[PDB]
């Protein structure tokens, strides 16, 4: 409803993402990197739209450190930094892949070019299948495979994944027409593996879905807290770690997940352990072009 | 508006579908089969929602005979019969695979069970991803591959493919939640091939997409007929082969395509030419269950 906040969120997302790239040096602790970016988001005037994802190599997405994580970056690691910022619910979602301490390679170039190719065809009145075809052709002509179950997505106020997605493959019936004012995150994922991700432990990210009558008090009040503190945007297990002892925390989240009150987003790994590269920008559809808010 | 028109469309689609199975015998002309099915739809009181698709073996979908087509069913052929009926815009979309002159096999069973699995979990409140998972699990545990770029779809009045899809694979962000009153066609495709379909000539089905000024007169009268008789639902090239000679028809159709008035839907073939099996039903989502309009 207001492009000013979408542009502000995008400007902030761009700034933090570019600083995150500078911090991604061999030896950097992931936890330290994550907290710096999220603090930087704060210091600039926005709130995180979701916890910063730092996904290494075959880990495609949904990895955000936790208090006690000793993972450090290593030279040669294909680190995907996925950052989201929101200004009053208006979101900017962007991502880049850095090969730690090294230079970009062909796998990375395929994902980045696929993104450029989809932005180039996007405008009001274009069918989503057109973006999908653009993305897939760029990835496949370079000898890589697109990830079929991870895609771009429509973004609405306080709703990161609005329902309509922009696949990284051409689907003949993806006939949703981009409308003026539509906000979408386009995110090609390329890999040398099979082209599919699966969920694996641990679950570091969750999202509130519904108020469920939970009996045990500890879980009942956590839902209430999650509810008004995070609302409908994804939150990290890390964000709740100092609020209560880890043991009961894990139990409460489980109880809430088992009752269907919140849903967990387990780490996503490429099925054949193939390295995954990803690039992403958020766009606002205009009549004849698109505005890339995170560029 | 009314679940009654939806129920009515489904009853006719089922009857017609059950008749088509009986006629799928060796030596049957696809053209004879398509014409009989479509005439029966009209005899029963409905109008085709799309032309009867008769897709054999590696041809996954979008094949509908044309006048002069000599294709006949051979014993052993995996015939996918996809039929749709509408009653004043309210659609029933259903499909079955028959191994011509033979009994059902594991490939067909996987697709069928995948469908039954998705339906058993569907009800208001469930995210689309849960249906994707159910489908993918039944196809994969039997050793086959779900088709990644062909899938189920939300159905709206006079809109066969409404935007929201139900994939045959699990995607973690398919979080559209089924709502009471939603109408969807669940359609698992399974194959022994790679699991992906590509577009190949000919284009035997088209669909009116936008009201554009046509400079040519026969193209303009043609578009007038399309808008008048088919509206926004797909139509077969076959349905127009009598209005004007082939050459005039081809050129008028190309002018309309270039003008952006209609969109062509080429035949879909499994990329590694693997046999494709498909089953499909239309469902109306209820509070605690679903009505399968096409059973
Ligand atoms: Co992102
Ligand atoms: Co995204
Ligand atoms: Co169908
Ligand atoms: Co269908």
In CATH, what number does B195-271 get? 1.10.10.10
Q: Hey, are the CB atoms on B172 and A148 less than 8 Å from each other?
A: no
Any A CB within 8 A of B174 CB: yes
Owner of token pair 């593996």: A193
Question: How far is Cα B102 from Cα B26, in angstroms, rounded to an integer?
Answer: 10
In sign, the C-alpha dihedral spanning B99, B101, B105, B109 is: positive
Give every CB contact of residue A223 below 8 A, 6+ residues apart in sequence: A208, A211, A212, A214, A256, A261, A262
Out of A58, A93, A138, A182, the active site residue is A93
The answer to the question of whether A153 is labelled as a binding residue is: yes
How many beta-carbon contacts under 8 Å exist across A and B?
Answer: 53
Q: Is-contact B231 B208, C-beta < 8 A?
A: yes
Residue B35: burial class (beta carbons within 10 Å; 0-12, 13-18, 19+): middle
In a mutagenesis test of the A interface, which of B61, B149, B278 is the best target, namely the one with the most A β-carbons within 10 Å? B149
- Is position A281 annotated as part of the catalytic site? no
Assigned architecture for domain B1-194+272-295: Alpha-Beta Complex (3.90)
Question: How far is Cα A158 from Cα B81, in angstroms, rounded to an integer?
Answer: 43
Resolution (Å) of this entry: 1.8
Extract the tokens encoding A55.
Answer: 């996904």
B46 Cα to chain A: minimum distance (Å): 24
A26 Cα to chain B: minimum distance (Å): 31
- Is position A174 annotated as part of the catalytic site? no
In a mutagenesis test of the A interface, which of B84, B139, B175, B177 is the best target, namely the one with the most A β-carbons within 10 Å? B175
- Is position A182 annotated as part of the catalytic site? no
Residues in chain A: 295
Residue B179: burial class (beta carbons within 10 Å; 0-12, 13-18, 19+): exposed
Helix (H, G, I), strand (E, B) or coil at A86: strand
Out of B82, B130, B136, B138, the active site residue is B82
> CB atoms < 10 A from the CB of B204, how many?
20
The answer to the question of whether A161 is labelled as a binding residue is: yes
- Is position A93 annotated as part of the catalytic site? yes
Question: How far is Cα B150 from Cα B222, in angstroms, rounded to an integer?
Answer: 30
Q: Which residues have C-beta under 5 Å from ligand 3, the single-atom ion?
A: B 82, 93, 95, 280
Method: X-ray
Domain range list for chain A:
1-194+272-295, 195-271
In chain A, whose CA is at the least distance from the CA of B150? A171
Residues in chain B: 295
Q: Is-contact B262 B256, C-beta < 8 A?
A: yes
In chain A, whose CA is at the least distance from the CA of B152? A173
Pairing, β B197-208 against β B262-270: antiparallel
Extract the tokens encoding A72.
Answer: 């450090």
Question: How far is Cα B34 from Cα B81, in angstroms, rounded to an integer?
Answer: 9
- Is position A75 annotated as part of the catalytic site? no
> CB atoms < 10 A from the CB of B283, how many?
27
In chain A, whose CA is at the least distance from the CA of B200? A172
Residue B289: burial class (beta carbons within 10 Å; 0-12, 13-18, 19+): middle
Any A CB within 8 A of B170 CB: yes
Q: Is-contact A16 A85, C-beta < 8 A?
A: yes
Burial B54-90 (b: 16+ CB within 10 A, else e): bbbbbbbbbbbbbeebeeebeeebbbbbbbbbbbebb
Q: Hey, are the CB atoms on A176 and B163 less than 8 Å from each other?
A: yes
Residue A141: burial class (beta carbons within 10 Å; 0-12, 13-18, 19+): exposed
Ligand 2 center to A92 CA (angstroms): 9
């Amino acid at each position: 409803m207001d492009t000013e906040k979408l542009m502000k969120a995008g400007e902030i997302a761009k700034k933090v993402r570019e600083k995150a790239i500078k911090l991604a040096r061999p030896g950097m602790l992931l936890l330290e990197l994550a907290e710096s970016i999220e603090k930087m988001i704060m210091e600039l005037g926005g709130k995180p739209a979701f916890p910063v994802n730092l996904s290494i190599n075959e880990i495609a997405a949904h990895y955000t450190p936790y208090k006690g994580d000793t993972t450090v970056l290593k030279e040669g690691d294909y680190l995907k930094i996925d950052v989201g910022v929101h200004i009053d619910g208006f979101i900017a979602d962007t991502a880049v892949t850095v090969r730690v301490g090294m230079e970009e390679d062909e796998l990375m170039e395929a994902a980045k070019e696929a993104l450029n190719a989809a932005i180039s065809v996007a405008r009001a009145g274009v069918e989503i299948k057109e973006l999908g075809k653009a993305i897939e052709n760029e990835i496949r002509k370079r000898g890589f495979k697109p990830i079929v179950n991870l895609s771009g997505h429509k973004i609405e106020r306080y709703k990161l994944h609005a329902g309509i997605s922009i696949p990284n493959i051409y689907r003949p019936h993806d006939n949703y027409v981009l409308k003026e004012g539509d906000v979408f995150a386009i995110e090609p994922f390329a890999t040398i593996g099979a082209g599919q991700v699966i969920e694996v432990p641990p679950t570091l990210i969750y999202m509130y879905v519904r108020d469920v009558p939970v009996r045990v008090a500890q879980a009942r009040f956590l839902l209430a807290k999650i509810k008004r503190e995070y609302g409908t945007l994804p939150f990290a297990y890390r964000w709740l770690q100092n609020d209560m002892p880890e043991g009961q925390l894990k139990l409460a989240l489980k109880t809430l997940e088992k009752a269907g009150a919140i849903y967990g987003y387990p780490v996503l790994k490429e099925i054949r352990n193939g390295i995954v590269a990803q690039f992403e920008h958020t766009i606002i559809v205009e009549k004849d072009s698109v505005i890339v808010t995170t560029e």
